[PDB]
RNA sequence: GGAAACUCCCGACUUCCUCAGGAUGAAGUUUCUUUAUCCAUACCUUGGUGCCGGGACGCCGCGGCGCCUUCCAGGAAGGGUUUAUAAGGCAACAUCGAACAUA
DNA sequence: TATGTTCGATGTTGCACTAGAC
DNA sequence: GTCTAGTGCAA
C-alpha cells in the first residue's frame, strides 16, 4: 500500500538525519580545517541497552542480603555508609581536595603568605592575576602535563602558563606580567629539558621564578616558602585530606541532620574565601571533590590507614596536625568511629579477582551526592528569600525572625552559632504554623498576603528497603486504624443520640434530593423516586463488576427484591455499563434505567431493606481475610453506610467530640482540608476528615495486598566497561560454499586460522585461539570474527576468572580488543535479541561508529508476599542480574547531503492521523496544491481512549517495592506516543519533508499529543528537549537554505512586537497555531468564522434552507425525515442529513448551532470504531465537499499546511 | 493494498509472528522484490491469537439465529465494517512540587 | 470547594592519561 | 612489559 519505514530502517533514517543537522555539518567542516576529529568533541548520544545476564548455575553468588548490605554502604546516609563518613569528615574538622598537592599547602597555610604577595603583585603589575600566588604556584610547577601539553616547545610552555594564569592571547599587548611569562617561559625552555624534569626540580624552577621576579620588584622567596612548608609537612603520602584549626567541630550529632551542617559549614567558608564561584559549585568542589578524585585515596588509603592507627599515641595526631590539648580531638574519635563502622569492601571483585574498593565507586557516589548538594543548596536560597520576600498569629512574628537565623545560619551567613539540631526542628514547626494561618486566609475570603507554606528541606536516602519491617508496620497500622476508626464513629453518633439531633435515617436523602430539584413536584413523589435511586446507586456501585461473595450477595439483594428488570440489572451489574441514578436535568441523560414498575418499595423501606442486608454481610465478612476481594467490597459498602449514618445530623459538632483520635505513628500528614480544630463547630464537615481513615486504610491495605514486587540493588564502578567475546564452543559451523568466492574469505583459508572437524565442520573455540595469536592487527579477522559463532558475555563480578590460558578476547571502551584469559563457567551470558547483540559487535569491530561506555550491574531480587499466620510474610523469589550498557553513537559520519523540499502538515484524528504534503517550490499565492494527502491507522489511539473511560484494573507487572502507585497508565502513553511519532517519521522519509504540528486543545489522549510534540518541536525545558534529542540522535536544528519565515515576538504586558523575517530552521519540525484550522475548508479556501464575528457585532432561509452570506450561499440541513425513525437503525446508517431546514427567520445563535451541527457530521456506519464527528463538508454550494464529504483530519491537515505556507513568505 | 473474517461489551487458563548481519545468485533505471546456505537466540513494552465463562443489543416462530442491502427459486451480483506487512524502546538514582481530571 | 485519581520536573552519573611501582 | 593510583583535561 503505502508502507512506511519501521524498526532499523527508521533508526537509520533518523540517525542519518542527525548527521545533517546544523551542528553536525559544522563538525564535519571543522574536520577539514581541524583535520583530526575528537570523539568527545562532536555530536553523539547515548543509547542504553539492558541485557539480563544468564549466569550459569553452580556459581558462587551471594545472598541478596549480602548484596543488599554493600549497596547500602554506598547509598545510605546512616553510620556505616560512605555518605556519613564524608559528612563526618567535614563535620569532624577536615577538608578534602582533588589532589595531594593542594592538601599539603592547605595544611601548611602558614608557610605561604599569599595575602601579601598578591598585594605586592598588584602594585607592581598593577592588576590582579589569576592564580599567581606562591601557594598555587607550587602546585602548578609540581603538577604534570598530559597529551599535547607535554610538548616541550617555548610556545606550549607559554600556552599553558597563559591558561593557568588566566592570561589571554595578548602578544601585542606590552603588559608587565604578560612580558614576564614570556621571559619566564623563555627562560624555562632553555634550562630544563622536559616538563617531567620541571616537576622533579621544583625548587630550581621556584628559584628561577623568584629570580625573574627579583628584577621587577621585591617579592619574598617562593622556594623558601616551598621549602618551609615542605619542611613542616607531616601528612601521609598523597593525602587528599587536611585538618583545619580554624574549623569548628561537631561530633556526635544526628545522622538525619548531619548533611545539613556540613553543607552549612562549607557554605560558611564560601564567604570567608570570598569566592566568585556559585555556592552550588563551591561545595561540590569541596565535598565530593571534582570527579570523585579526592575520594580516590581517601576511600582506599585514607580509610585503611585511619582504622589501623590510633587517635593519639604514627599517631594520627602529628600526621594530621591536631590541637596539642584536646581542643579538637573529639573530632578524630568521630571519624575513627566512621571508618570502622563502614564495613570493609566486600564480595565484588575484578577479573582474576581481587576485591574492589570504595574508591572504585567515587564517580557515581559523587554524582549522587553532588546532585543533592545542588538541589539542597538551591532550596535554602529559595527559602531565605521566601522569608525575606487565634493566639498563633502571636506566635508567627515572634517566631518568624528566629527563622531568619535558622535559614541564615544554615546558609552559613551567620557566625553567631553553627546550627543546632533544634534549629532544624523549629523550622518545620514554623512551617507548621504559617500554613494554618494561610488557610485562615482563605477562611474569610469566600465569605466575600500569602502566609503560604514553606518548602521542605531535602533529605537523602537509599539502600534496599526493609521489606518485612515495612510490611509489619503496615499490618499494625491497619489494625490500629480500623480500631480507632470505630471509636470516632461510635462516639459521634452517640453524641448525637444524647443531643437527639439525628435526622430521619432515610429522610436525609429525600430531603437532600428534593433540594436538588428546584420545583414543587407534587408533595413527595418526584423526589422520593430519586431518593430510592441514590441509595441504589451508591450501594450499587460497590459490588458492580466484582465477583466476590459480597458482590454477588449484593447482586442477590437486587435480584430478590426486584428493583429492576433482569436485563436491566445485568447491564448495570454484570456488563458494567449504564447507571441507576442520573443527575437530574442531566446534561448527558444516557438513557436512565427503569426501576421495575411492579416493585412497590418505598424509600424508607429500602434503607430498612438494605440495612438488613448489610447486617448479613457483616456476619460473613468475619470469616474472610482483611486483604481480600470480599473485604474490599464490604469496605465499599461500609463506607457508604457509615457516611450516610454520619450524615444524618442536622446540627454542628463540638470539637472535643470530633478530634481524629489516631496516633501519629500510624499516620503522616493530613491535607489542608483538615487544617482546623474560635469558630470550630463544623456543620456536617466530619465526613471529609472522617474519610481519612479509609484512604489511610487503603494505602497500607494496598501494600499488603500486592503479591509481587522486586527490590533493586545497582552498582556502577569505574572501569566496568568490559564485555567479553567468546566462541560458542559446542557447535559445528558449516561455512557456506559460496563464501569462498569473495576475496576476503579466500584470504581466510590461507591464514590457517580455521580448524576443521574430520567432517569439515569448523570448530569455534579452537579456531578462536588461532585468531588471537597470529601476530598483528586483529582487524584482519574482524569479518570472520563477525561470522564465527560467538557469544557476548560478562565476567562474574564476584569470583575470579583468573585464567591459565587465553580463552577469549575482551573488548573495552573505544574498541580495544585485548586477548585475555577466560575460565570455564566464569562468564555470564548476556541475553538479548539480534539487533541488540549486533550493536555489541559494532562496538568491537567498528568503534568509530559506536563504542561501549561504563555499564551498570543491576540485581533485582524478586520477592513475593503471601498470607500465613493471618499476617503477610514476604519470601525471596527469583534473582535476575542484568547489565545496562550505554552505547555511544559517535555517529559523526556523513552521507550524500540533502535537504527538505516538501512540508508535512499533520493533523490528528482520534482514530489515527492525517497528513498533507506541499512542495517547497509552490510559494506563490496560488498553487499551494498539496502534493499528497492521506491518513494512517494507529490503533493504539483508540485503545487509549477506549480504556480510560472503561476504568479497568491496570495490568499487573512487577513493581519496585519502592513504588507505591501504578505506572501502568504511563507506560502505555509512552507507547502510544511512540507509534504516533513513528508514522510522521515514516512519512517524513518518503516526502523528504519536515513536519508542522498543531498546538494542542478526550484528555488522556492529549497527554500523548503533548508528548509527541516534544519529539519534534523545540522547547527549552529539559524534559521536552530530552525526548527530542533521543529521536534525532542528539541533533539540534536543521536550517533550510533559501527559505525563511516571518516571526512575531512580544515586548511587555502582552503587546505585539514586530514582524521580522529570518532563515527557516526546523527542529526538524515547526509549529502553527491551529485556530479553526478545522472550521475552514481545504478546497473552498473559505472559513465560516467571518460572518460568525461580523454578525455577532451588529435570517432569510429558503424552502430548502439557503442563506445570503458575503462569500457564497451556506445550505444548512436537518435530520432527513424521509424514511422513518425505526428504519435507518435497521441498517445502522446513522440518519444522514439530506433533509433541509427552512423556518423563514432564524436567530443569530441558531445558525451557529446549525452550522455546528451541520459540518462535522459523523460516520457512515453505526459499527464504526469512530464516534467522533469524523466528517466535515464546506457549506457553500460551491465547495466540492458539500455533496461529497471529507475527513476532518485531512481537511484540517490541509488548512494547516496552507496557513503555515503563507508564513514562509520567503525564498 | 494482497488475503481474510463478520452484532456488542466485562472476565478466565493456553500458542508467538515480526526482529540485526555475512559470502550468493534470478530478474526488473544506481535504487525494487524474490531465493539458497550461514552466524545473530530472541530482552522491556504495546500487542496479536486460541479458548472457555458470565452477560448484553438488533430482529424474528422462555426459546433459534446474528454485518446492511438486492435479484433464481438455499444459491449468484453489490455494498459496507475490521485487520498484524505488527509498533515503540536512554538508562539509573536521589530530590522537589503539585498536577490533572468527573458529573 | 468537593469527590478520587495520579504524575511533572531538577540534578547527577554513564572520564582518560601516564609516572612510577608492580 | 605489565599494571594501577594519581589527577589533568576540557570547560
Ligand atoms: Zn468548500
mmCIF file of N, CA and C and ligand atoms in Angstrom, chain A residues 1081-1086 1176-1180 1182-1186, ligand 1:
data_model
loop_
_atom_site.group_PDB
_atom_site.id
_atom_site.type_symbol
_atom_site.label_atom_id
_atom_site.label_comp_id
_atom_site.label_asym_id
_atom_site.label_seq_id
_atom_site.Cartn_x
_atom_site.Cartn_y
_atom_site.Cartn_z
ATOM 1 N N UNK A 1081 -12.243 25.472 4.983
ATOM 2 C CA UNK A 1081 -12.280 24.391 4.019
ATOM 3 C C UNK A 1081 -11.012 24.326 3.215
ATOM 4 N N UNK A 1082 -10.548 23.106 2.963
ATOM 5 C CA UNK A 1082 -9.326 22.892 2.198
ATOM 6 C C UNK A 1082 -9.492 23.314 0.741
ATOM 7 N N UNK A 1083 -10.517 22.776 0.087
ATOM 8 C CA UNK A 1083 -10.784 23.093 -1.311
ATOM 9 C C UNK A 1083 -11.353 24.498 -1.475
ATOM 10 N N UNK A 1084 -12.437 24.781 -0.759
ATOM 11 C CA UNK A 1084 -13.081 26.087 -0.826
ATOM 12 C C UNK A 1084 -12.089 27.213 -0.556
ATOM 13 N N UNK A 1085 -11.421 27.145 0.591
ATOM 14 C CA UNK A 1085 -10.454 28.146 0.967
ATOM 15 C C UNK A 1085 -11.075 29.252 1.760
ATOM 16 N N UNK A 1086 -12.305 29.009 2.196
ATOM 17 C CA UNK A 1086 -13.040 29.981 2.979
ATOM 18 C C UNK A 1086 -13.584 29.485 4.301
ATOM 19 N N UNK A 1176 -16.523 16.274 7.701
ATOM 20 C CA UNK A 1176 -16.811 17.702 7.529
ATOM 21 C C UNK A 1176 -16.919 18.138 6.080
ATOM 22 N N UNK A 1177 -17.932 18.932 5.701
ATOM 23 C CA UNK A 1177 -18.072 19.397 4.308
ATOM 24 C C UNK A 1177 -18.258 20.931 4.241
ATOM 25 N N UNK A 1178 -17.499 21.592 3.372
ATOM 26 C CA UNK A 1178 -17.617 23.029 3.198
ATOM 27 C C UNK A 1178 -19.081 23.296 2.912
ATOM 28 N N UNK A 1179 -19.642 24.306 3.563
ATOM 29 C CA UNK A 1179 -21.052 24.608 3.383
ATOM 30 C C UNK A 1179 -21.539 25.189 2.084
ATOM 31 N N UNK A 1180 -20.675 25.928 1.429
ATOM 32 C CA UNK A 1180 -21.073 26.546 0.205
ATOM 33 C C UNK A 1180 -21.532 25.490 -0.739
ATOM 34 N N UNK A 1182 -20.724 25.818 -3.599
ATOM 35 C CA UNK A 1182 -19.545 25.809 -4.458
ATOM 36 C C UNK A 1182 -18.576 24.700 -4.062
ATOM 37 N N UNK A 1183 -18.206 24.669 -2.786
ATOM 38 C CA UNK A 1183 -17.284 23.656 -2.287
ATOM 39 C C UNK A 1183 -17.683 22.268 -2.780
ATOM 40 N N UNK A 1184 -16.686 21.442 -3.078
ATOM 41 C CA UNK A 1184 -16.931 20.088 -3.565
ATOM 42 C C UNK A 1184 -17.198 19.114 -2.420
ATOM 43 N N UNK A 1185 -16.889 19.542 -1.200
ATOM 44 C CA UNK A 1185 -17.094 18.709 -0.021
ATOM 45 C C UNK A 1185 -18.553 18.717 0.426
ATOM 46 N N UNK A 1186 -19.297 19.726 -0.015
ATOM 47 C CA UNK A 1186 -20.707 19.852 0.336
ATOM 48 C C UNK A 1186 -21.472 18.580 -0.010
HETATM 49 ZN ZN1 LIG E 1 -15.673 24.125 0.192
#
